[PDB]
Amino acid sequence: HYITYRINNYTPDMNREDVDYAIRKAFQVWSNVTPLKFSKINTGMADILVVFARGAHGDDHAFDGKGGILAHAFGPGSGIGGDAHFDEDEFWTTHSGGTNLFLTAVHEIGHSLGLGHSSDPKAVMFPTYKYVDINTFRLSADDIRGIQSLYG
């Protein structure tokens, strides 16, 4: 099978350069341990979507503001399957600031691939908001094998 991604979201209080690499790296930190492939399409979204919205987007799944669900992407599949949801009213920040655009992008992208919602406590896959140094920003814990093997 073939895989494809497409990003198109830019929130305030954060340079477009941070978000660009934030998500762009999310595909690497994940693909680092996955049989999947790589296909950066310039035009033509695919099973994997990425868009930021504020609460109820007319016909979407509203979440909340700063504090609640900063971003939660449902499992993969058709259409919605593999869609990213980033709270607009939220407060995005660098790898140091609270809402880690990088780490978050990896957590949301994971749920829209084949991740549960916990795996391990130390792992960065846990359902929580934490900021880690981009220098060491990378997959860890046993989860690293739960993505490459994909069993349960």
Q: Are 119 and 142 in contact (CB under 8 A)?
A: yes
Residue 111 marked as a ligand binder: yes
Which listed range, 26-34, 43-51, 83-91, 127-135, lies at the site for Co ion (CB under 5 A)? 127-135
* Spatial CB neighbours of 81, under 8 Å, sequence gap ≥ 6: 47, 74, 75, 112
- Specify whether 108 is catalytic: yes
Give me the residue whose beta carbon is nearest to Co ion: 127
CA 19 to chain centre: 11
Amino acid 75 reads G
CB 111 to Co ion: min, Å: 5
Beta bridge partners, 5, equal 40
Amino acid at 89: D
67 vs 127, which CB is nearer to Co ion? 127
116 in contact with Co ion (CB under 5 A):
no
Question: How many C-beta atoms surround the C-beta of residue 24 within 10 A?
Answer: 14
Retrieve residue 98's tokens.
Answer: 């609270």
Find the catalytic residue in 5, 108, 134, 146.
108
**Closest CB to Co ion among 35 and 127?**
127
Q: Count residues binding Co ion (CB under 5 A).
A: 1
Q: Could you say which of 38, 89, 127, 128 contacts Co ion (CB under 5 A)?
A: 127
Which residues have a catalytic role annotated?
108
Give the binding site for Co ion (CB under 5 A). 127
